[PDB]
Amino acid sequence: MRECISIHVGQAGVQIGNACWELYCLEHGIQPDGQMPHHHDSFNTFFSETGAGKHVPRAVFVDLEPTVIDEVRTGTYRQLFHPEQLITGKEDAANNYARGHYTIGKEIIDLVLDRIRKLADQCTGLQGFLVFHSFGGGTGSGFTSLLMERLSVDYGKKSKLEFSIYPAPQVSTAVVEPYNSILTTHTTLEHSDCAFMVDNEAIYDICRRNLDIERPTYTNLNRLISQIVSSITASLRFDGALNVDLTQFQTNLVPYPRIHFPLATYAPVISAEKAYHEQLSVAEITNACFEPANQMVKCDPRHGKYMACCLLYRGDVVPKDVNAAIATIKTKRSIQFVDWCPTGFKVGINYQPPTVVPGGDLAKVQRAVCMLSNTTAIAEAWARLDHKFDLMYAKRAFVHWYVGEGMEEGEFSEAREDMAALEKDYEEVGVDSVE
Amino acid sequence: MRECISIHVGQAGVQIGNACWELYCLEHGIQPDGQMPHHHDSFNTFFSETGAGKHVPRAVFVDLEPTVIDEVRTGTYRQLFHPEQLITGKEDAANNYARGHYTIGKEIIDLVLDRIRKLADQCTGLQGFLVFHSFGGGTGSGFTSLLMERLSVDYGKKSKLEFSIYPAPQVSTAVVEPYNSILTTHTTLEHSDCAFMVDNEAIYDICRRNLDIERPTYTNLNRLISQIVSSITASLRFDGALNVDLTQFQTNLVPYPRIHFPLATYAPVISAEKAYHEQLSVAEITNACFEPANQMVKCDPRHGKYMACCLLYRGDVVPKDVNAAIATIKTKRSIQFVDWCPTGFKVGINYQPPTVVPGGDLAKVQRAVCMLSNTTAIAEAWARLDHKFDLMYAKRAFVHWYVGEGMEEGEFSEAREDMAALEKDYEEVGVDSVE
Amino acid sequence: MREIVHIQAGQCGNQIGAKFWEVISDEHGIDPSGNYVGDSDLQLERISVYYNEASSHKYVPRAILVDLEPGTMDSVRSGAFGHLFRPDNFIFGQSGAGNNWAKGHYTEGAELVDSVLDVVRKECENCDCLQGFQLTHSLGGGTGSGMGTLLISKVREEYPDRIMNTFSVVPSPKVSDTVVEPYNATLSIHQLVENTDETYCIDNEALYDICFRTLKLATPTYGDLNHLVSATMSGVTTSLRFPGQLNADLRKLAVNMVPFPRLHFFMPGFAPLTARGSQQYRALTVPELTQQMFDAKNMMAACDPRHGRYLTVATVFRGRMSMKEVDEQMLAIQSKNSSYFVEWIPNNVKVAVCDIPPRGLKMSSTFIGNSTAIQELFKRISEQFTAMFRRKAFLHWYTGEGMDEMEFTEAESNMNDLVSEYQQYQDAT
Amino acid sequence: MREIVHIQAGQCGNQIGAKFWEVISDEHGIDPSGNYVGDSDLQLERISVYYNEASSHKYVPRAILVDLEPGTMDSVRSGAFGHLFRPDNFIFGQSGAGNNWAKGHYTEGAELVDSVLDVVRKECENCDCLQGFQLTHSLGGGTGSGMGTLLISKVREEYPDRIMNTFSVVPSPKVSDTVVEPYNATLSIHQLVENTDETYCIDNEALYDICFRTLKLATPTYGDLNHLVSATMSGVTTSLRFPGQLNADLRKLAVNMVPFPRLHFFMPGFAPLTARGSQQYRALTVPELTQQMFDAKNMMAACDPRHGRYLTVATVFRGRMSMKEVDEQMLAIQSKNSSYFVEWIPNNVKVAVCDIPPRGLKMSSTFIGNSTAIQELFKRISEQFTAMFRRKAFLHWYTGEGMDEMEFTEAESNMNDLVSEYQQYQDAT
Amino acid sequence: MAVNVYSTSVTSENLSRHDMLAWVNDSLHLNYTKIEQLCSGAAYCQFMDMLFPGCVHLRKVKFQAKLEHEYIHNFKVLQAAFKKMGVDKIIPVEKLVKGKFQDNFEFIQWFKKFFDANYDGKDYNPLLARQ
Ligand SMILES: Nc1nc2c(ncn2[C@@H]2O[C@H](COP(=O)(O)OP(=O)(O)OP(=O)(O)O)[C@@H](O)[C@H]2O)c(=O)[nH]1
Ligand SMILES: Nc1nc2c(ncn2[C@@H]2O[C@H](COP(=O)(O)OP(=O)(O)OP(=O)(O)O)[C@@H](O)[C@H]2O)c(=O)[nH]1
Ligand SMILES: Nc1nc2c(ncn2[C@@H]2O[C@H](COP(=O)(O)OP(=O)(O)OP(=O)(O)O)[C@@H](O)[C@H]2O)c(=O)[nH]1
Ligand SMILES: Nc1nc2c(ncn2[C@@H]2O[C@H](COP(=O)(O)OP(=O)(O)OP(=O)(O)O)[C@@H](O)[C@H]2O)c(=O)[nH]1
Ligand SMILES: [Mg+2]
Ligand SMILES: [Mg+2]
Ligand SMILES: [Mg+2]
Ligand SMILES: [Mg+2]
């Protein structure tokens, strides 16, 4: 009865969406061909049910390079997706924000908007959009900015959550990452209700340490991110002792218009062998999810002060021990809140234990926790990205490409000043003041 | 309801711990895999019962060389221990105190403390730590001095019992034993509540004479030492007519803060064939345990005076003959007490007869005694060790290894005078005083 | 005769109401299907106060469950004991209030309150002689707090000469369920103080402590918490639901408890509370009942009466006892604990006795205290709200849907005035 | 009427108390499950003195068992005869006092003293007319002596006009169970001589000696040991539990037994004590009962009276007899053994007679003597304490948890004062 | 930076319970009668201010705390002061707040040793500092 739609942009978005939709089909008991052998409706929130028993997802896969979309088309999930939904271009943006936002991206935006509009008018209780995109990728960044602008123009006030991929401090795959990230942050700072932030290096370290895999290809990272997304959406999809919604997340996590960059964490992430020798109590899973090294963004919250926290437990969970563990955590020494947030925890409980994908690295668990923390430690990441951008731009590198694809240096200057203002606001709000 | 954790450091600790934890599983009826076929609980003081019927011990095996820990991993007790608990380094300390305390140990100390805090916070009524470390080794001495400094800061006032291995007078496996032993005692003197002293040379004679075994490998010695450890904590796990606790040991054996070096003793120790021709009464095993040749440290108590004792019976023991037997022991002219200790006996009776490990040398016995005599005769052991250290240090032999690994020549002098302070402290209070 | 209309708001109201109707059906011997199956006719003597007769001797509750999100309604309909409610009363929206006063009082409040008011008016015109209204909700959530305030305002406008009770779940001091509690709590309490009659504040952490300590439960859950709250509510209403030696009504309790228009915040308590194992070693009698009732540890509001003075106290017994014992022990308690009672209100104890014991117990009792320890709760809430509003946090999202800073300022002023008057009446001689 | 409250502290108190409620239940014919199964109606005439009436004619003892470690409660609750104690009274800590005053009176005692005191206060309010308290503890342990004294100090503050007895277990001269005995004993007595109406000192070897020679037992365990103490402690109370020709009560004994406020340390005794084999060769009659109980061999404290003089003496007979036979021989004992009685107290023998014999015996008696020979026991203890304290041995674990040197000095000066006045009356003309 | 010190078992250095209360009362000129009344942490926060000028915003703490929730906020300020000066003693805040003799006596025992190590002998009037 409540429907939210998801837009996956770029190769990273498409791969993450493939993993996430595999997880959803496993969770709701839908066969890959679309048929099927708390639960009754549930699948109505994601899977639109057609005349026959077939269910089709509410997804819009959009890309400019056709390789990954063709791979998905010929993949095992071929009969599921609506063939008109998969929108592909002809040439990629080539890590060029100008190409993906001005030159090329303007030739497919109308078709993408038409498909979005048809899907929205199909539903009757539309709740929000979930945008899966990266930051370094040219098409991801450019088309994300274009879609934010167009969707904000079309639908006035709706929840628009994003699941980005912040560039790692040391690990790097591209070279124009600072330009792309600065530009995209300046453009879509205004048109986003709440953006969840994920980094690849931290997930690498988590998979290496906690799960103990020495061969962690991109599939494992995609599975972890998909698990986090499903844990976020489980409150809408399933009944529970205390339900939360997208508007609840947004309201409880964003205190100021500019400060809407929380970071996510999942627990427990343990292998099969280590599962038997562990008792998996609510208190210890809270402690593990709140431990500094388990955070999925490469930054230590100890360096800053927490601003808001959202805990979501799912499974055989008792609110009494939940509240006892949260009180203990608040009493603990590492967690230090800001002076103007006397209450700093929003708690949700769900009655559906998490499901395990087959062949996956994680083990079956009867209790799961997803933690969304809005804090100050992200200021160091913003400052590092700003420093990289300034160092690269001091002598006008690649600016010839960017300008040749229909841009001007005035845009770079405005993005730089906007990022500086955002960092200053973040630090000033985080720091204490007298009276 | 009562929990105590054990830390095994070095090869000596791990090898002893491998034999000791074999005994506890036998006593509580725990299969090596973890399942199971006075008892209602009992095993909760040592075995943390997990979600399934499996029980996992509360042990932390730490070593720098991976040679011996890997043997435990592949050994018959492979499924019992928690895989994360077994902590290993990369290279050993090589009989160097400086390497295992300054250079190499410091890089792994943080990881060990992480697992200690995780196990301590899981439990609720923690009493104290049992430390099984040697004295001559590098990681068994340098590293174990690091754990005491770290543990004492984190937990202020808790019991800390050391089951050390004193270097033998004539038998000597290593050559820098005086350098390591002198340095360790000066550092861990201020952070140990009660340290039990056990010497390898004295146990060889006990196994050769009483047990009548001419092939006493290190496996046989560790079984005999393990029975002492079990009797110390036998009161926590089992009921009795007169119980003792971990704190009661600490308050009854240490007249002065520096003088906390008792020596253990076990009785009866007889073979299988000699058992039938012995009636094994309470009035004689008390006599047997007091014989000068049965003491587990190579030093005759006849040369000194007893300061305090502690008996611990178990089995078909009736308190009337216990008190009658001790009265006859007191009036014997071989046992002489100090003047300022008119009362010099602490008793404790348990209802659990000691069990026997299959293939062991000891026979089934319905009565047992564990004696912890804090006597002045141990002052001879300090004097002998101080003689060796002063002999080699005069010409500065072997020092260039210690100095070059993060130590100073000045540090040796401070540890030398400290042992001189303890040596005359031990004598000046065991000797009589005027008035 | 003297029928009561029940209104439930939010997830908390819905769950508490589900447990409450379970308890009421058990008391009145009503099958889940809706047909009478019990034995004694004293149950049928007064069945119209809560239930409503219908064709083929069916009985349907006079309850109006309504909440913005649908999940709670789907749960209550699919679950057991959902075959007896009237589907017309099942009102719901599409999107939750998002823990927002604005979305709970102005945005979805309009449509939901229009439909709910229509249903309420139909039910009231069906009613013969209305006695009052009952509303169970929370002061921390968005939908429950905001829309319950809207419903109270509209119903108070429509029926000025009637009484209504509000069972509100006040936020906890230690741990807060939602980050922005104080804004909603302050606005809701201001509105309730303006236009409600009596209010029984109930906390969650105090309930948790009561269930863990006294009842000796390892894993206390919302089922048990709501069971305790429902028992309290049924104990309150049983006086007019059933005949007794010394009857009492909702109006009687209100007039005996409320000395001044701004002082109507009570703290409830229930006795006896015993674990399964230890019920056989205790003698069920009036002395121990009263001693168990009159100790802070058995109080359902996280406020220690030892910090204040009891302005007034009411006690509704149940089952069969002796008035001599009852008033003798009330006098003994008053004499022993005189230092805790206000000097300028003599004889500040009201006692009522019913005649039908609760199921599976010989006798029980419900104690309702109007004290001055709620001063500390209001002071803490005001302090938290003052800090957050001074730093101007989360406030753009209450301004973005209609309100302004003037409303917050006036609500804070009202809260400070109320707490100051409460204290100044506590410290009178 | 005149019911007494039983408090058990330490391991010895719990083990003695476990055998104590075995005898009391047998006397009153109470089944282990807790229901009456007796025959004679005289047993239920006075059952409220010890037991407590509950629902469904169940009876629950008025006992409060408390120990700092959970080892003791595990045995009594899981073992037989543990289905009848009230589970609320099972108060226990987690870590033992470790044979320390500080860890049993200041550090660990404070955490648990407030919890037990509330259970004590509950029992008194339930009580109709309180008579006094009964305490069984040890003078050598940490929790039995440390915290047991703490209850005495706190209870004496709340009920000043009550009489309570301590059935302590005074340490030994030959073999010491714990090495630091004198530090715990001397500090304990310095608190007992102030807040206790009467104290029964009991040794352990004098119990071994009695159970060895008189009872003909080579291997007496602690079960056969505590069984002897229980009869003596149940004999004192039986005067008010059952009708008698010449009744007595707890307060009556105190008036006769205690000439001076500081001189209230007694030496109990029991008779007849015969082995199973040699009971058929003796005719159970009053002549041997008085003869048997007055010799130094059959005394439960290792203090030979021939070294001192009896100040005053009680003798609580049981069974049924002739008052002439009883009174004829007390005069005969006094005249013949006149050298052992003080001169400035004439007729210093107090005699009481009950009417209900103990189980499996025609007649028995209990002898309580406030002799002067107790002086030697305190002289020896002060001798051991003095030698240890000069060398300051074992003392750095009493200062570390709260006390100081000044506390010990005032404890020894008080102890030395009591010995001097306990002897200067023996030699007074 | 500040110097640290441990405390496990020391002789002739631990002070009596009566003397410890006198030292606290004398240093701050107040009327604490029981040592277990130190659950508030107001005196503890003042100690850090005396040892190191600044490092603690004394305005944040309040000395009129009487509730369980109020006791915790006072200790959270002390938690930040410990971190800023780099000390590494973990306060068992879950156990001090209950106001029992056991845990409250051990913490002040440790704090007395910390006080002596980082005292330069400076003096002032806490009355004007408190008001
Ligand atoms: N977490 C995660 N990140 C991915 C994955 N695949 C690609 N990425 C991220 O995507 C970035 C590369 O840019 P893309 O967003 O893929 O751009 P594109 O889809 O190749 O299209 P162009 O920008 O035109 O080249 C890398 O920096 C990766 O961090 C993936 O499978 N998982
Ligand atoms: N009782 C007993 N002692 C042992 C055993 N194995 C080794 N030891 C003692 O350990 C000493 C050897 O040094 P260790 O303490 O083992 O040092 P390590 O663990 O090998 O670590 P490194 O010093 O770095 O080599 C010898 O002097 C022995 O006395 C054993 O199995 N039983
Ligand atoms: N007594 C009791 N209280 C509850 C229970 N469940 C939740 N609560 C409390 O009630 C509040 C629930 O918020 P609601 O008023 O129901 O709001 P909602 O239904 O989630 O809808 P929104 O306000 O729009 O988010 C929480 O803050 C809890 O403290 C329950 O089962 N029993
Ligand atoms: N009569 C009698 N005395 C006993 C018995 N068991 C132990 N005792 C005595 O009581 C003393 C026991 O110490 P407790 O006072 O119980 O101390 P605890 O309960 O173990 O607690 P801690 O002092 O902390 O160890 C011993 O010294 C014995 O002399 C018993 O069964 N019967
Ligand atoms: Mg691409
Ligand atoms: Mg080695
Ligand atoms: Mg809701
Ligand atoms: Mg004990």
Residue numbers in the entry:
A (entry chain A), B (entry chain E): 1 to 37, 40 to 42, 47 to 441
C (entry chain B), D (entry chain F): 1 to 429
E (entry chain S): 1 to 131
Q: Which text from the study accompanies this structure?
A:
Microtubules are tubular filaments composed of αβ-tubulin heterodimers, which adopt a pseudo-helical geometry. Microtubules switch stochastically between periods of growth and shrinkage, a property called dynamic instability, which is critical for their function. Microtubules are stabilized at their growing ends by the so-called “GTP cap”, a region enriched in GTP-tubulin as a result of delayed nucleotide hydrolysis after GTP-tubulin addition to microtubule ends. The structure of the microtubule lattice in the GTP-cap region differs from the one of the GDP-microtubule, allowing members of the end binding (EB) protein family to selectively recognize the GTP cap, binding there with about ten times higher affinity than to the GDP-tubulin-containing microtubule shaft.
Here, we generated a hydrolysis-deficient human tubulin mutant with the smallest possible modification by replacing the catalytic glutamate residue by a glutamine (αE254Q). EB3 bound to αE254Q-microtubules with a dissociation constant of 8.3 ± 2.9 nM, as determined from measuring the mGFP-EB3 fluorescence intensity along the length of αE254Q-microtubules that were pre-polymerized from GMPCPP seeds, surface-immobilized, and then incubated with varying concentrations of mGFP-EB3. To this end, we imaged undecorated microtubules and microtubules decorated with an N-terminal fragment of EB3 consisting of its GTP-cap recognizing calponin homology (CH) domain. EB proteins were observed to induce compaction and a negative supertwist in all previous EB-decorated microtubule structures solved to date. We report here two EB3-CH-decorated structures with a negative twist, but an expanded lattice conformation. This expansion means that the presence of a glutamine at residue position α254 at the catalytic site can inhibit compaction, possibly arresting the microtubule lattice on its pathway toward the GDP-microtubule lattice state. Remarkably, the EB3-CH-decorated αE254Q and 20%Q + N-microtubule reconstructions preserve an expanded lattice (82.87 ± 0.00 and 82.89 ± 0.00, respectively) while displaying an induced negative twist (−0.23 ± 0.00° and −0.28 ± 0.03°, respectively). Considering that any previous structure of a microtubule decorated with EB3-CH showed both a compact and left-handed twisted lattice, we can conclude that the presence of αE254Q can block the lattice compaction of a GTP-microtubule lattice, even when only a fraction of tubulins carry this mutation as in mosaic 20%Q + N-microtubules. In WT microtubules, a negative protofilament twist may be transiently required to facilitate compaction of the GTP lattice to allow for efficient GTP hydrolysis.
